[PDB]
Design a protein around this ligand. Sequence first.
Ligand SMILES: [K+]
Ligand SMILES: [K+]
Lengths: 431, 431
Amino acid sequence: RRVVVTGLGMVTPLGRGVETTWRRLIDGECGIRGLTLDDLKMKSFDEETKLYTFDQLSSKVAAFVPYGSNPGEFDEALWLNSKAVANFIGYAVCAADEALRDAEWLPTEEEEKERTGVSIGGGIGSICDIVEAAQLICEKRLRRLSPFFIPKILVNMASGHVSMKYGFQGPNHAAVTACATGAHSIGDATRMIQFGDADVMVAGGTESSIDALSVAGFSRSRALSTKFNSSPQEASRPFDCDRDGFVIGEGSGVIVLEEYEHAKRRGAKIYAELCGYGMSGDAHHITQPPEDGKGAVLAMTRALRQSGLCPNQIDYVNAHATSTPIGDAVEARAIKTVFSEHATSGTLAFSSTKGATGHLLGAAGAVEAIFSILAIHHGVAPMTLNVKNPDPIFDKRFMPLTTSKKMLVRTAMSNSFGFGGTNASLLFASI
Amino acid sequence: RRVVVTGLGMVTPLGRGVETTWRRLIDGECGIRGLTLDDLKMKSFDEETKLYTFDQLSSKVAAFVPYGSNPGEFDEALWLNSKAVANFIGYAVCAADEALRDAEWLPTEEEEKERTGVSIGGGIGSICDIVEAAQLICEKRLRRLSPFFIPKILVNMASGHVSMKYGFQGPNHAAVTACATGAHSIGDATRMIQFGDADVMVAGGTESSIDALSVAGFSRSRALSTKFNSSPQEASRPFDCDRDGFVIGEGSGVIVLEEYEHAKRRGAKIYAELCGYGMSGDAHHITQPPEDGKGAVLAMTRALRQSGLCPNQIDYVNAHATSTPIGDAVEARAIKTVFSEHATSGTLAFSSTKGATGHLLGAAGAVEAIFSILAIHHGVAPMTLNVKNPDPIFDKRFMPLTTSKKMLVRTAMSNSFGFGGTNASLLFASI
Ligand SMILES: [K+]
Ligand SMILES: [K+]
């Protein structure tokens, strides 16, 4: 059975909603800004502690979702109106609602509901809530501990809330694979529709981990940018010689997947087909990828094999490149190994959009799958921001896009690599 | 493509190793004991705060993995080595090593290593590590934050560590669905092998969340047992009239899934075939299942449909029953609905093993899948512990096993339900 995409939904640092997010992306906007004390998410702590904590953060930049009741903004009064709903859950529900309405899939009949599943995973969940609760132990004020604490920190709850809201009784699933979470969640959902576990799946990823401990943690791992704290708009620069770590972002990406015949029967407009779901493991290091990028090569190759397409048949690649010294170079190297001539000649189009959205972690793979689907749908490939001095590996021919260019895009591949060497590559095609 | 099990590995409150755990389980033993200050995992806190916290805990019972260098014990020196290894990671690696050696699968060939994947998820991760980091904020000592903090809290690292340990470059995945995590991780691995993503998968679940905040959190949610703090071994009593919540347990379950032909060609030992992976969502409440147990019914019915078997062909059912008033009753009604005459005849054998192991959360689904496989392999169905007064729903005929029954077990079903209404049902059969 074939699987197509009939609905898109998302909330990102470029805005709430696919239309607004895509328009701003293409036009070259950036959602990164400088951190403030409010961004620590430490409302339960005194100012002295906030000030101290802020100063301990090496990375002071991030990509935030715009809150508000205005158009293009995420309304917390609408999506975060429950004690059991953490931010990552609200982002997921917000995005899923847009996607479902886009696909016009809000069934009332039990049979349709029973054949609809959910697979939206979260990468970390809600460290903020855990820190607040932990503070209760340090200060001996456990009486404040809420019964909704456990429910709101479980990374699988984003999927639970979406199914409960729409009555979806099909597979209630969640894949958690660090920075690849969004990809595997969509991939697993696709495997489920293929096998027959469901006819419709609402899948994607969500992440809301911009806070004191999250920033301190990733900084301690030396994975975040710190060189451009005074110039945030220049912090995320995938493939650029001056990159020094990724910029933490937040948001969610959700798509509606469904069996091909099912979509045609009801006359739904189809964005594209999901033809490849390549998975692999680096089996190398907990945080660093192999110099040869074998894992990345495997993921992309497996996705190709599954689609029955040759390397030269791929028009666009949305690179994972998070603006990391080693990471970005390894992927560029893997792209050369996989597409060889097709890439070295300049025929292949590829870019990273994290320069604009930042690294959405658990949601990165979902949002980027949406961008890949949209490139095919609109025949426009997004630019890579801040590539002032291309990495030595690139040249006059093999070079990432630095401007959003019009072009026919019948096939698009999106890569996602997370900590622990977990790799996934999603391949989409027009149908 | 058929999928069989060729390797079993586990670390539980009943002992380290399948041999020990199974033996004690069948002999009607229990791994639950009373909580102490040391179990809070609050090494970085003073006595006064430990006492305060302990005093606030309504539930003072839990099931711990036995540590030691003697047979049947978990040697932390062999598994809890690096500073990047949290308990849930160590348990997973330990269990995986036993599962792989049992299946005699430690390939040196790149092809076989590339065709071997890992899918072991964690349900919560390492709360105690976050609590410790949080304390650094309250005490303004963030310079002591470990550079391995992030790698230690990522619930997907278990599959990452296992993969790099054996060089497995197949799909590096993890399914996180609360109490059903172990079941979905195994089911997703099965789908991957069926589709051709890999020929071998090391799948299961792991959990080690016995600490201050985990216990305080679950207690506040009113999900844990509290009336038997003075009689730990009596605290977990699935299907019993005096049940009052589950008992937090820790451990890991890992099995080796293999494509049928691949297993036969290498002359590998085969325990059974995984014939059904039924998934569903209650789409009801965040923590409570529907009175009619429709979700449970759908999950079991789906695994059945997938296997091509009818209810009367099922010999053993390992219920999820965590010793909860509403939960246990709901699943009991669901079982009766699904198997009707096969249940009311008294021939169908069913039981819950959580009275002995406690609720292993993320690992529950995997450990219990192993018990189901072992029931088929050994021809012995595990008893339900502490059923002094059977729930009113039961009678002379329709009654869970209260003694280990020697019987032919050709087929076995294992149910796993988690918060968010996420349901999974795994069906195994001799081959
Ligand atoms: K990507
Ligand atoms: K079970």
